[PDB]
Amino acid sequence: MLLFCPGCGNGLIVEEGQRCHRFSCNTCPYVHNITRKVTNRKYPKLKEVDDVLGGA
Amino acid sequence: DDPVVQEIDVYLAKSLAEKLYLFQYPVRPASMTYDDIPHLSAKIKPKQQKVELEMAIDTLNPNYCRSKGEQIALNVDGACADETSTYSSKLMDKQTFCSSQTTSNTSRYAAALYRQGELHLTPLHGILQLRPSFSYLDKADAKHREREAEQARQRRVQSYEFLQKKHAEEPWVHLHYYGLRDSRSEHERQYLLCPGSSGVENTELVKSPSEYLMMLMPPSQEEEKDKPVAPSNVLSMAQLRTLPLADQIKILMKNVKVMPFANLMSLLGPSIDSVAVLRGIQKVAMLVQGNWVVKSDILYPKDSSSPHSGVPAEVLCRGRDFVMWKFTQSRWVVRKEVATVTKLCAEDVKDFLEHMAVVRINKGWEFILPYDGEFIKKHPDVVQRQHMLWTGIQAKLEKV
Amino acid sequence: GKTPAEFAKLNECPLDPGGYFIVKGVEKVILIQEQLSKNRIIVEADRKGA
Ligand SMILES: [Zn+2]
């Protein structure tokens, strides 16, 4: 997941927010302040069935 | 299935042709626009049209790190010098955008406005992309670096510097910005609504589809490498383009040895002059057993010689003429001895037997096809005229 | 463009393939060469797998 600055179009980066943590642009003063809880979903793959059932 | 629905008319407006320009922001998704943003200055370089903007941005707002704004403001300009200051205030209250030209020819592109029952069209005088300027870092770097701190001929015609001088020769023309919310927009938008009736026959658009095709996709070559007299192998079913008819039959009759005329007009076209081609066929063919046969004298040019890889000999057409005479007098050549009848050898004569005839066992050759209905055409003088020809050639060969 | 009957006068043979050269008196052929195509992108895996 990548996120871009509306101010300058460049990718946004998280920083040590003063009260709440923060996305900030590396160059322009545009900033974004974390309000909500947020996650991204991976869902990795699992082992196949043949040798997981084979032989009990 | 017929054009049964939505038969909307079309209109064209020239009032804004030189004024229309198309601007887009690839970085700006369509879900919001810049209506709320005052553009504080606008500029154009009309010669080699290219555009620059300047606009304001809010600073008090929480998505603005005013501390960062101040810290970088002290850097992009001279910290306390402001020789060429881009922001008199110590905060980034403004931004600027640049533009990029999209094509060298806008003629094939036009703007279109849809209205119920009518479409209005107008060309575009230019299309430029738009870029957010990142140059403030560049001048911060320049500030830090400066704080830290006749003639011979050339082959530099393709220089960057030369085209930048050409670009710099044009000073920047400035404009006053007015947003889409201004009544100015509608006050001018009406100009594209061109006057006119609902529909009138166009002065243009007259050319036919075949004509439209030819000038749409013209020949890449304007002059042909060789003539249609067939200096090289050439089409036969696609009739020769401009060749005179008398020479067209000559071309056709060099291929096939004998041919009844009744199938020709399929090749030269039904519109062929029947009387003229009958006048021309006598020049190249002579009739035997109801069929027009190629003249030897045009089959062998004068300077010919025994072609086949056998006994060399000059252009002795007399013998081939004699076998034609045998076909004329008799029904068919039942006898082999026709070679020695005119004191020729086997190879000398065999090839012309296979020009028209086919073998029967121990009983010689007969034509491949029978006498056809040439008598259906009324010109009995032809058989007599050939008769005088047969008589003359007979008188010659009787000297043997 | 010659005819087989007048090949004999040049001492040449009607069937000879042609298409070769004569240099210093020894007949020589320029063999057809095979090249790989150019200006065409291709992706591949190195010996290391990358
Ligand atoms: Zn940014």
From Swiss-Prot, chain A:
GO MF entries: DNA-directed RNA polymerase activity; nucleic acid binding; zinc ion binding
Binding-site positions, Zn(2+) 1: C5, C8, C25, C28
Keywords carried by this UniProt record: Antiviral defense, Disease variant, DNA-directed RNA polymerase, Immunity, Innate immunity, Leukodystrophy, Metal-binding, Neurodegeneration, Nucleus, Transcription, Zinc, Zinc-finger
GO BP terms, alphabetized: defense response to virus; innate immune response; transcription by RNA polymerase III
C4-type zinc finger span: 5-28
Known function: Core component of RNA polymerase III (Pol III) which synthesizes small non-coding RNAs using the four ribonucleoside triphosphates as substrates. Can mediate Pol I proofreading of the nascent RNA transcript. Anchors into the Pol III active site to constantly monitor transcription fidelity, cleaves mis-incorporated 5'-ribonucleotides and restarts the transcription process. Once Pol III reaches the poly(dT) termination signal, can induce Pol III clamp opening and transcription termination.
Family to which this protein belongs: Belongs to the archaeal RpoM/eukaryotic RPA12/RPB9/RPC11 RNA polymerase family.
Protein name per UniProt: DNA-directed RNA polymerase III subunit RPC10
Origin species: Homo sapiens
Gene name in the database record: POLR3K
Full-protein positions shown: 1 to 56 of 108
Curated annotation (Swiss-Prot), chain B:
Keyword vocabulary terms for this entry: Antiviral defense, DNA-directed RNA polymerase, Immunity, Innate immunity, Isopeptide bond, Nucleus, Phosphoprotein, Transcription, Ubl conjugation
Residue numbers bearing the Phosphotyrosine modification: Y191
Modified residue annotations for Phosphoserine: S159
Any one cellular-component term (Gene Ontology): cytosol
Record localization: Nucleus
Keyword Ubl conjugation: yes
Biased composition (Basic and acidic residues): 141-149
UniProt name for this protein: DNA-directed RNA polymerase III subunit RPC5
Lineage summary: Eukaryota, Metazoa, Chordata, Craniata, Vertebrata
UniProtKB/Swiss-Prot annotation, chain C:
Compartments, as annotated in UniProt: Nucleus; Cytoplasm, Cytosol
Binding residues for RNA: K38
Binding site for DNA nontemplate strand: R47
Domain of life, per lineage: Eukaryota
Biological role stated in the UniProt entry: Catalytic core component of RNA polymerase III (Pol III), a DNA-dependent RNA polymerase which synthesizes small non-coding RNAs using the four ribonucleoside triphosphates as substrates. Synthesizes 5S rRNA, snRNAs, tRNAs and miRNAs from at least 500 distinct genomic loci. Pol III-mediated transcription cycle proceeds through transcription initiation, transcription elongation and transcription termination stages. During transcription initiation, Pol III is recruited to DNA promoters type I, II or III with the help of general transcription factors and other specific initiation factors.
Homology family: Belongs to the RNA polymerase beta chain family.
Disease linkage: Leukodystrophy, hypomyelinating, 8, with or without oligodontia and/or hypogonadotropic hypogonadism: An autosomal recessive neurodegenerative disorder characterized by early childhood onset of cerebellar ataxia and mild intellectual disabilities associated with diffuse hypomyelination apparent on brain MRI. Variable features include oligodontia and/or hypogonadotropic hypogonadism. Charcot-Marie-Tooth disease, demyelinating, type 1I: An autosomal dominant demyelinating form of Charcot-Marie-Tooth disease, a disorder of the peripheral nervous system, characterized by progressive weakness and atrophy, initially of the peroneal muscles and later of the distal muscles of the arms. Charcot-Marie-Tooth disease is classified in two main groups on the basis of electrophysiologic properties and histopathology: primary peripheral demyelinating neuropathies (designated CMT1 when they are dominantly inherited) and primary peripheral axonal neuropathies (CMT2).
Gene that this sequence comes from: POLR3B
